[PDB]
Curated annotation (Swiss-Prot), chains A, B:
Organism: Severe acute respiratory syndrome coronavirus 2 (2019-nCoV)
Effect of substituting residue 142 to A: Does not affect ability to cleave and inactivate human TRMT1
Protein localization: Host cytoplasm; Host Golgi apparatus; Host nucleus
Summary of the function given for this chain in its UniProt record: Cleaves the C-terminus of replicase polyprotein at 11 sites. Recognizes substrates containing the core sequence [ILMVF]-Q-|-[SGACN]. Cleaves and inactivates human TRMT1, preventing tRNA guanine(26)-dimethylation of tRNAs. May cleave human NLRP1 in lung epithelial cells, thereby activating the NLRP1 inflammasome pathway. May cleave human GSDMD, triggering alternative GSDME-mediated epithelial cell death upon activation of the NLRP1 inflammasome, which may enhance the release interleukins 1B, 6, 16 and 18. Also able to bind an ADP-ribose-1''-phosphate (ADRP).
Protein name: 3C-like proteinase nsp5
Gene for this chain: rep
Amino acid sequence: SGFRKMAFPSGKVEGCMVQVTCGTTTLNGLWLDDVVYCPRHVICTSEDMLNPNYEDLLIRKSNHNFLVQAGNVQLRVIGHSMQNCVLKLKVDTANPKTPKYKFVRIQPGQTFSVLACYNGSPSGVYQCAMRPNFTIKGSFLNGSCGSVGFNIDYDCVSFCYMHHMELPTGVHAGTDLEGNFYGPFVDRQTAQAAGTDTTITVNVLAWLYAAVINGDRWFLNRFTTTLNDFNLVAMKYNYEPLTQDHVDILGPLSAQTGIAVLDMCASLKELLQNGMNGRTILGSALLEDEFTPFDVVRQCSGVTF
Amino acid sequence: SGFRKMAFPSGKVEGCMVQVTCGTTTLNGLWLDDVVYCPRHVICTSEDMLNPNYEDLLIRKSNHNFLVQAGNVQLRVIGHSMQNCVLKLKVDTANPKTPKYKFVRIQPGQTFSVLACYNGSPSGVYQCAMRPNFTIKGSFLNGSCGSVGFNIDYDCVSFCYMHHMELPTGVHAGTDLEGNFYGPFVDRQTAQAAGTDTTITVNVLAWLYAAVINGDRWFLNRFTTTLNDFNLVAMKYNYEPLTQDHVDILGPLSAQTGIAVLDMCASLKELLQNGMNGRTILGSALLEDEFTPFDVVRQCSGVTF
Ligand SMILES: *[C@](O)(C(N)=O)[C@H](C[C@@H]1CCNC1=O)NC(=O)[C@@H]1[C@@H]2[C@H](CN1C(=O)[C@@H](NC(=O)NC(C)(C)C)C(C)(C)C)C2(C)C
Ligand SMILES: *[C@](O)(C(N)=O)[C@H](C[C@@H]1CCNC1=O)NC(=O)[C@@H]1[C@@H]2[C@H](CN1C(=O)[C@@H](NC(=O)NC(C)(C)C)C(C)(C)C)C2(C)C
């Protein structure tokens, strides 16, 4: 039936996007009820960003200094506060298009959709994974700050990410909706190093189950392995260790295909040691780790929202 | 800044999705103003689909036989007609969430976003390209029929595709919003062969410009070539011929990067003859042809809708 990197329908999130302007800085904001959430560096000038004192710059700002716009319509700011690296601008009007929502902090290895926005207007939507080094491989230009990452559960929008900065080699970093950065990053234009990234093993295994479901079965060998032996091989190839919790999460795909997780582990062990010999799996020449076991089932067994 | 397969924000299209039921068949419909558009095989039973007479089966159907639902809310059907392979069900209520729209027939090689739906509910959004053989590499299960492909131009939704069937190796076929199939396909469960696919050359060249913009420049050689010589090489590798119209369409990227189209053609000619030696371009190990020159500029120079 086909397998694509599918993003969540962005509608519920689009109705929340606002444009936040302070002084000469404009970025995106998330308007849920009577509160607007945006990165705190909206109160910075290009020079402050080199080493800023956010608490100090916010003292010198009053409510009227924040120009918040939902399309053409300006929202009056009646309060402002700082929660970590995020600004909460209270507005005189509650967002009527606010969906049922939660603020979650995703774990590394989990996926989400990013609705990239410029001037409070959505330009596109794509699926991302929180890398083990706490970064994301996104597509963001100047003005994309404030764009959010999310997941949908029938009617509930679970917001997990807000864009803040770009790192070397097109890697991106940001915070949860409580202003807490994911990883060892700070909102300052100073040298900051991202840790070594690893391949999300449980996601590669889920992608191998998606391939069998879809008819691509060539890589399947006639062997099994132990959780210990597999982890010895994977360690060399910069793959994160597979835990028994990862084995249980993979249960549904294993039961659906009839392939025990440890037999799929033996097939993956062979693809790491022998290579793919110029062959593809689900049209891909590289092993993919940006599809969780849930993304696989939701896609290959039509979960709607 | 990063480069991802980005889809258009699905919001404007989500507000148009309905569930269409006739007898025991349920699929998706597009509700624009007081009309619902859906595949005509909604009036078929599993046995009719083997060799159906749509004109005959539609005679035996009256308005009340179509159960149309927008969420919980049932829409009363006050008229029905057939335009090619599509059904137009007139309803007593105009869709208040209808956006400014057009119905276009895209040319092969062009891209669009697919909002995959089940029971009139959106499950996800992804970017597709109309293959030169008039098929799409989508992700559709049973119940996905009626899901639509589209493009957005600031506020205008240009609907170009409606899902009808699946072809061998996870390839998909459908119609424009006037019920005309793309390619030599008919809505019947009989053996039908899809032509040989080719690689969209102008899209690969646009993707090579996206890579230079993003800093991946290793594949750039110190040579130029003629339009004729390049097309001789490309022909062997199953690449469509590059026309002078394709050269002019690539102008903006060429002017932005300072790389003449024929110099980029020489670099591509070398990648076809010598291979990539295990290297990647924009994180990809294979040459990508599902990004038009417009997708490149819109992404690398933030066009919002
Ligand atoms: C954001 O402020 C906006 N308005 O879009 C912007 C988004 C960036 C710009 C290019 N692509 C993006 O994703 N973010 C910033 O300008 C933040 C901001 C100031 C510096 N900054 C950066 O992202 C810089 N990166 C950086 O310093 N990276 C280190 C060295 C820390 C790993 C830079 C060089 C402008 C991309 C602060 C407060 C961090
Ligand atoms: C659609 O009717 C729905 N309700 O979703 C369904 C969508 C299919 C089912 C699996 N994945 C999809 O995208 N489409 C159909 O069932 C259409 C319909 C009947 C047969 N059909 C097919 O897609 C079949 N394919 C087929 O016959 N392919 C040929 C041999 C013509 C190239 C099949 C085998 C059910 C997938 C009609 C009227 C064409």
